Amino acid sequence: ISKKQDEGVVVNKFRPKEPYIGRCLLNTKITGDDAPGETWHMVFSTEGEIPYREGQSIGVIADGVDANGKPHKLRLYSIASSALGDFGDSKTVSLCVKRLVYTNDKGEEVKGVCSNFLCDLKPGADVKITGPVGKEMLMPKDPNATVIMLGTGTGIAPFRSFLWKMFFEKHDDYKFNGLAWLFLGVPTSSSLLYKEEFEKMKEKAPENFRLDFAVSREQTNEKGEKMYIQTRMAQYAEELWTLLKKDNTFVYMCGLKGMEQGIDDIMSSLAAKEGIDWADYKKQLKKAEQWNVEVY
C-alpha cells in the first residue's frame, strides 16, 4: 500500500489565469522517420519554480484561439523527467509529446492544436505552463517495493521519471533495492522511446530492473499472434500473478485508453483459474493503492 510519496506534494501552484511562462531549451524528435508518427522529447526552463514530483503532469496552454475566439484550454502532459530533471539541476521539466495529425483514414486532415504546438517549439520560445497536477501516479514510499510499470507509447513518460530517480540518480534518502519491471508496447522499433536509456539501466542494475519490449508489428508469439503489451505479459502470467498477491507490489499503467481492456482480458483468465473474480480483485487492489491507472 505504501501510500505513495505524497508528503509535501504541491498541486496546481500555477493555474490558467496566471501560469508559469517557461522557455524551450531543447526539442528533438526521438522516433525514426519510418515510425507511424513522431514523438518529440522537450526540455523547458522552470527556474526551480515548479515543485513537481515523479508521476505528475503539467498543463500546457497552446498559443492562439479556438473556433470560438477563446484561448485554448490546457492539455495535460505527463512529466518524463525526474524531479531533478535531465540536467540534474532541479531547474527544468521535460515532456514526451506525440504529434497528433489524423485524417482517421481519408478526408480532411486535422492536427491536434496543443501537440503540434509543442512539437514545433523552437529553442528560445516561451510556453505557458500550469500545475503540477496529479497524485494517483506517485511512487511508492517503500524502497524495496515491487513496481510493475505497464505503458504504451507516450505512457512511458512517468516511468522514465521513476527510473531516473531509481537508477541514474543517487539519493541517500532513497536507495531502491526492490524489483522494477517495465513493459512497453510500441508498433515498430523506430518507435521505442528512450531504448538506449533503459538498456543502460539494465547494465547498471541487472538484478533490480527487468525490461520487456513489445513491438506489435515485428514480433509474434508461438501462435502467430502480434506481440501487444498484454501478449508479452502473458508469457509471464505465472510470475505476475504471484507477485500481484504480495502487499508491497504496485502496478502502474499509463498510455492509450485502448490498452486497459487488453490487460483486463489477460488478468481475467489468470484470476479465474485461481478461483477469484478479477473485477472484485482489481477493485481491492485499487483501494490498497496497488493498481494505479492513468490512461488517455
Ligand X SMILES: Cc1cc2nc3c(=O)[nH]c(=O)nc-3n(C[C@H](O)[C@H](O)[C@@H](O)COP(=O)(O)OP(=O)(O)OC[C@H]3O[C@@H](n4cnc5c(N)ncnc54)[C@H](O)[C@@H]3O)c2cc1C
| Contact residues: ligand X, CB under 6 A | 57, 75-78, 96-98, 100, 102, 104, 112-115, 154, 157, 294, 296
- 161 is known as an active-site residue: no
Q: Which of residues 102 and 174 has its CB atom nearest to ligand X in the complex? A: 102
Q: Which of residues 45 and 57 has its CB atom nearest to ligand X in the complex? A: 57
163 is known to lie in a ligand binding site: no
Closest residue to ligand X, based on beta-carbon distance: 112
- 119 is known as an active-site residue: no
Least distance to ligand X, CB of residue 89, Å: 22
Q: Which of residues 25 and 97 has its CB atom nearest to ligand X in the complex? A: 97
Catalytic residue among 77, 194, 228, 252: 77
- 24 is known as an active-site residue: no
294 is known to lie in a ligand binding site: yes
Least distance to ligand X, CB of residue 280, Å: 27
- 82 is known as an active-site residue: no
- 78 is known as an active-site residue: yes
Q: Which of residues 96 and 184 has its CB atom nearest to ligand X in the complex? A: 96
> Using H for helix, E for strand and C for coil, what is the string for the chain?
CCCCCCCCCCCCCEECCECEEEEEEEEEECCCCCCCCCEEEEEEECCCCCCCCCCCEEEEECCCECCCCCECCCEEEEECCCCCCCCCCCCEEEEEEECCEECCCCCCCEECHHHHHHHCCCCCCEEEEEEEECCCCCCCCCCCCEEEEEEEHHHHHHHHHHHHHHHHCCECCECCCCEEEEEEEECCHHHCCCHHHHHHHHHHCCCCEEEEEEECCCCECCCCCECCHHHHHHHHHHHHHHHHCCCCEEEEEEECCCHHHHHHHHHHHHHHHCCCCHHHHHHHHHHCCCEEEEEC
186 is known to lie in a ligand binding site: yes
> Which residues does the annotation place in the binding site for FAD?
75-76, 78, 96, 98, 102, 104, 113-115
Q: Give the residue numbers annotated as catalytic, written as ranges.
A: 77-78, 254, 294, 296
